[PDB]
Amino acid sequence: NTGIASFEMEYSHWLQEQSRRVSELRTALQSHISDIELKMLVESCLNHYANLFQMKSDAAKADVFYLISGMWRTSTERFFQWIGGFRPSELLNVVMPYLQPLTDQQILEVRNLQQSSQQAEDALSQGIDKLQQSLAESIVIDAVIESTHYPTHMAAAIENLQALEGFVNQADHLRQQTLQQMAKILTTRQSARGLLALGEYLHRLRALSSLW
Amino acid sequence: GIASFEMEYSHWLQEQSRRVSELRTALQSHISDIELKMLVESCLNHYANLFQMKSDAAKADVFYLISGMWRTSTERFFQWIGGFRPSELLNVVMPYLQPLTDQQILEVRNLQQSSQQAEDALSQGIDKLQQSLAESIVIDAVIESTHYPTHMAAAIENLQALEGFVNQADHLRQQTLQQMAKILTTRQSARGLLALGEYLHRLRALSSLWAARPQ
Ligand SMILES: CCCCCCCCCCCCCCCC(=O)O
Ligand SMILES: CCCCCCCCCCCCCCCC(=O)O
Numbered sequence: 117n118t119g120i121a122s123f124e125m126e127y128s129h130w131l132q133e134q135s136r137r138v139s140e141l142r143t144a145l146q147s148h149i150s151d152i153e154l155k156m157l158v159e160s161c162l163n164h165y166a167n168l169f170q171m172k173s174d175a176a177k178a179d180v181f182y183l184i185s186g187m188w189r190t191s192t193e194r195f196f197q198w199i200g201g202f203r204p205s206e207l208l209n210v211v212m213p214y215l216q217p218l219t220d221q222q223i224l225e226v227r228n229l230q231q232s233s234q235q236a237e238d239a240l241s242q243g244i245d246k247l248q249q250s251l252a253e254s255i256v257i258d259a260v261i262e263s264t265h266y267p268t269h270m271a272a273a274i275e276n277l278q279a280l281e282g283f284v285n286q287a288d289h290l291r292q293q294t295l296q297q298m299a300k301i302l303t304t305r306q307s308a309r310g311l312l313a314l315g316e317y318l319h320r321l322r323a324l325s326s327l328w
Numbered sequence: 329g330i331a332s333f334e335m336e337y338s339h340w341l342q343e344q345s346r347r348v349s350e351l352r353t354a355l356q357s358h359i360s361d362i363e364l365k366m367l368v369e370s371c372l373n374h375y376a377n378l379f380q381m382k383s384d385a386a387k388a389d390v391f392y393l394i395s396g397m398w399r400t401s402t403e404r405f406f407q408w409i410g411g412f413r414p415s416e417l418l419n420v421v422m423p424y425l426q427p428l429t430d431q432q433i434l435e436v437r438n439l440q441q442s443s444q445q446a447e448d449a450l451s452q453g454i455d456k457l458q459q460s461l462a463e464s465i466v467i468d469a470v471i472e473s474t475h476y477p478t479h480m481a482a483a484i485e486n487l488q489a490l491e492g493f494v495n496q497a498d499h500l501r502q503q504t505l506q507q508m509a510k511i512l513t514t515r516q517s518a519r520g521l522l523a524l525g526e527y528l529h530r531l532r533a534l535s536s537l538w539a540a541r542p543q
Binding site: 117181185187249251252255270273277313321327 | 468
C-alpha cells in the first residue's frame with residue numbers, strides 16, 4: 117500500500133522533528149529565552165501536532181483500518197489508544213500537575229475544556245459503537261448462511277469500515293481544538309511547560325513495552 | 329508459555345470449528361433431545377477450555393494476553409478485556425434465538441443489562457489502573473535521566489493487576505453462557521451457540537476482507 121508506506125516514513129521523520137521540539141522546550145525552560153521567542157516555540161510545537169493530524173488524515177484515505185488499529189504505534193501506545201491516538205481529556209489530566217500553579221479561573225476553564233472534550237470523545241465512541249453494531253449485523257447474516265452460493269454483505273462491511281475515516285478526522289480535530297484552547301487559557305510559560313510534559317510523556321510511553 | 333498458549337489456541341480453534349459444524353448438522357437432523365443436550369454441553373465446555381487456557385496465559389504474560397495480539401485485527405477492533413463484551417454477543421445472537429416467550433425475553437434482557445453493568449465496572453477498574461500507570465510514567469518522563477531512579481517496579485507490578493481483570497471478564501463470559509443455557513431450551517441453546525460460533529468465525533475473516541478491498 118503506497119499511502120501507508122508514505123505515512124510510515126513521514127511519521128518516522130515527524131518523530132525526529134518532535135524530539136527536537138521537545139529538547140528545545142526542555143532547554144528553553146532553563147535558559148534566558150525571551151517571551152516572544154518562547155511564544156514562537158509554543159506555536160511551532162502546536163504546528164507540529166497539526167502536521168501529524170494532516171499526515172494521519174492522508175493515511176486515513178489510504179487505509180483507515182490500519183490507522184485505527186495502531187499497528188504503526190507501539191504496544192504501550194495501543195494500550196491507551198482511542199480512535200487512532202489518545203483521548204485529549206486524559207492527556208490533559210496527565211499534564212495538569214506540571215502546569216501549576218494556575219489561577220482558579222484558569223483551572224476551571226481547563227476543567228470545562230476537559231469536560232467538553234470528554235463529551236465529544238464519548239459521542240465519537242458512541243458513533244463508532246453504532247458502526248460496529250451495523251457491521252456486526254451484516255456479519256452475522258453472512259455467518260449464519262455460510263455459503264458463497266448466496267450474496268453477502270461484503271461491500272457493505274467495507275463501507276462500514278471506510279466510514280471510520282470521518283471518525284479519525286473528527287478525533288484529530290478534537291485533539292487540535294483542545295491544544296489550541298489550552299494555548300489560549302495558559303500563559304506562554306505554562307503552555308511550554310504543558311507541551312514539555314506532554315511531549316516527554318508521549319515519548320516515554322513509546323519506549324515502555326521494552327520495560328515489561 | 330506464551331508459545332504454548334498460542335499452540336493450544338490454534339488447536340482450540342480447530343476443535344471449535346468442529347463443534348460448530350456438529351451443531352449445524354444437528355439442527356438439520358432428527359437428533360434426540362438427549363444427544364443435542366450432550367452437544368450443547370460440549371460447546372459450553374469448549375468455551376470453558378478457552379477461559380482456562382487464557383487464565384494460564386495471563387500468568388505468563390498478561391500484557392500480551394489483554395492486548396489481543398494473539399487474535400486478529402478485527403477481533404481487536406471489537407475487543408473488550410481480552411475478548412468480546414458478552415452483552416454485545418447476546419445482542420448479535422438474539423434474533424436467532426427467536427421465537428422466545430415474553431418471560432424468556434425479559435430474563436435475557438435482564439442478563440444483558442446486568443452484564444453491561446458488570447462490563448462497565450470492570451472497564452472503570454482498568455481505567456483507574458491506566459491512570460495510575462500514566463501518572464507513574466509522566467514522573468519518569470519529566471525527569472528523564474538515568475541518574476534518577478524510575479517507577480518501573482510500580483509500573484510493572486500494577487500492570488500485573490490486569491490479571492485479575494482478565495480473569496473476572498472471563499468469569500463474566502462463562503456466567504453469561506451458563507445463565508443463557510438455563511433460560512433457553514436445549515434447541516434454543518443449540519441455535520444460540522450455532523449463531524455465536526458462526527459469528528465468531530466469520531468475524532475473524534473481516535481483516536482478510538478489508539485487506540482485499542478495491543483500492
Ligand atoms: C498548550 C498545550 C498544553 C498541553 C495540552 C495537553 C492536552 C492536549 C491534548 C491533545 C494533544 C494531542 C497530541 C497527541 C496525539 C494522539 O492522541 O496520538
Ligand atoms: C447461548 C448463548 C449465546 C450468547 C453468548 C453470550 C456470551 C458468550 C461468551 C463467550 C465468548 C467467547 C469468545 C471469545 C473470542 C475468541 O477469542 O474467539
